[PDB]
Amino acid sequence: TSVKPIFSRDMNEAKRRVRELYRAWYREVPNTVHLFQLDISVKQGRDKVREMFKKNAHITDPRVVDLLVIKGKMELEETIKVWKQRTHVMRFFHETEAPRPKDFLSKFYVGHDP
Amino acid sequence: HPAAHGVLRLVMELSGEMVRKCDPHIGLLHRGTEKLIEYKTYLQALPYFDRLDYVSMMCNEQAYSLAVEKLLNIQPPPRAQWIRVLFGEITRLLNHIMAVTTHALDIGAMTPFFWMFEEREKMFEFYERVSGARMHAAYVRPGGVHQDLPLGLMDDIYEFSKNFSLRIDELEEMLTNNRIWRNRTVDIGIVTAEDALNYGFSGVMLRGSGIQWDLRKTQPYDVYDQVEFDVPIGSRGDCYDRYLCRVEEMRQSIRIISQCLNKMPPGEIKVDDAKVSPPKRAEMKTSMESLIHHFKLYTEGYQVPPGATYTAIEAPKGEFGVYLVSDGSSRPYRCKIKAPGFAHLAGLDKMSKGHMLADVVAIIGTQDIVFGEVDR
């Protein structure tokens, strides 16, 4: 498709990029974990980062892989600074929300027709 | 406390004293408007224009009701408009009673507030007697004024106006040449440039700065043409010459309210053609044709032809837009509102670099930034 790409060209400089800002996240999880005075096992903070970057795996295209970045490149602005107050962060790890069954026969006794 | 009846959070990196940096975060009041006005009809969705700002009430809706009558090719009848000057130019006595005071409550004084709001009350009756409610009152419509005003008000407007130029002389001896105030504001936050235009600012922080233009006499509204007034102007671009417009702009209004009580001709109020106005309660209640245009007019709306407009007015603190697409049928399509607060606060970061921190509290007050409006 003819439209100018954003940053990358095909898939390599692109997949050099996603490798890159990983470390900015990987090098800085914990400085926050003492800064907000939020308490968690610092390794959790390194599981989620690696839990997300493995999530969107099937992407076939440039200008998508550049699009996601422009989001991801942002967040390091807010989080590495303090523009969030504890409660824009911890929302990643959902503490309160009761589990979903996701199995079959556990559904059939609770809830209609999902 | 210095929120000016609003909730902003601004962040500055100051250099040891001087600010030299500011980058505010708006978006605390967003509420999700223009996504919700594609989903409502034309007469049903009116108030969400009245609730936009808190201070000017009938001056909003004067800027919507004029952006619809266009697409309909219809004008109000003569006694319509000459209301919309009397209320339209009476709420310029509101935002200029507020922005001289609840600005100068930050400068720390007490009385110029507790001294005035004795009076800003005597006005709020006149919203209640005319139609219903304390502040937000939905009165103007696409067809000119809703319903006529009682027997009265013209001995309560006259009786009240001839008392008023004194009150505005208790905000003068108490302010202008009082030194501790003159020194809190002169040569403070001066934007004299042709950036003060390049940003596209609206009225005051224009007209008080030199460059000379106003949308009341360069464009007509609704008979605004037939009354005479002079647009005060400032010398140097600082704040204390954006204050001095807002006194000599409260002493112009009492000319028009005094000039507009003499002329109001008898006549109907609603637009006559009745497809866009409902009928009375004598007519819808006997003849036949007066339901099918009162009972299809309270479910779907008018039918307002397709095609896009724009429009503008002079609202007490600056312009007000409506960019109203319409798709050719009853519910609208984008209704995009612009009010200042995307200019007058686009230009803080610029304006203030090189003065202290205890100025930046008293810079804001002169733009008259009032939020929930930046729902723009």
Binding site: - | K40, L43, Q44, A45, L46, P47, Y48, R51, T111, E118, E125, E128, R129, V130, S131, G132, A133, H136, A138, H146, Q147, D148, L149, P150, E170, E172, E173, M174, N177, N178, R179, Q212, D230, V231, P232, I233, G234, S235, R236, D241, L244, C245, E248, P278, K280, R281, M284, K285, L291, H294, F295, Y298, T299
Partner: protein
């Protein structure tokens, strides 16, 4: 047209410049107003002494709701489902179902009193002229379980004063 404000020049002569050096250094201004324009306290205060005295209003005022009934009562509402359909906020909720004789009336009628934005759009769409915004600011109870209204809260709240209401409309109905 125009005007020019703050465009002036000092005179620069020794008859003047004393008058501006008898000002800075002797404070001949700045005691002019706030030595005086402040006092000027000798005016009668303006206060509406509240628990007893009360302030003005007008016959077109808006407020707590009601449902009238004619002389011997019909529950004037016919459930034509309008005051429901012009409502911007969508407070109103109506469920009709044919009453025993065969004249239609309501069953559930609920004005939420939090959502209602006080238009004056539900006073002005009712053709049989039932539902009417009362002029009493009686309100403020302590539980949000409450302000939601049912039908049979309204009627009383609108038969508690009909000497208030039935004498306003006959001032106001000649205009609209």
């Amino acid at each position: 047209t125009y005007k020019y404000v703050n465009l002036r020049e000092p005179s620069m002569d020794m008859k003047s410049v004393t008058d501006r050096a008898a000002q800075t250094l002797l404070w001949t201004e700045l005691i002019r107003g706030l030595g005086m324009t402040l006092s000027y306290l000798f005016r009668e205060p303006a206060t509406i002494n509240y628990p007893f005295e009360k302030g003005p209003l007008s016959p077109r005022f808006r407020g707590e709701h009601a449902l009238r009934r004619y002389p011997s009562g019909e529950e004037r509402c016919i459930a034509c489902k309008l005051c429901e359909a012009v409502c911007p906020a969508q407070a109103i909720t109506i469920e009709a179902e044919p009453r025993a004789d065969g004249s239609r009336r309501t069953t559930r009628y609920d004005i939420d009193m939090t959502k209602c934005i006080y238009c004056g759009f539900c006073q002005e769409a009712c053709p049989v002229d039932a539902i009417v915004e009362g002029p009493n600011f009686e309100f403020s109870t302590e539980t949000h379980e409450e302000l939601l209204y049912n039908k049979e809260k309204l009627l009383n709240n609108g038969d508690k004063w009909e000497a208030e209401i039935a004498a306003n409309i006959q001032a106001d109905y000649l205009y609209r």
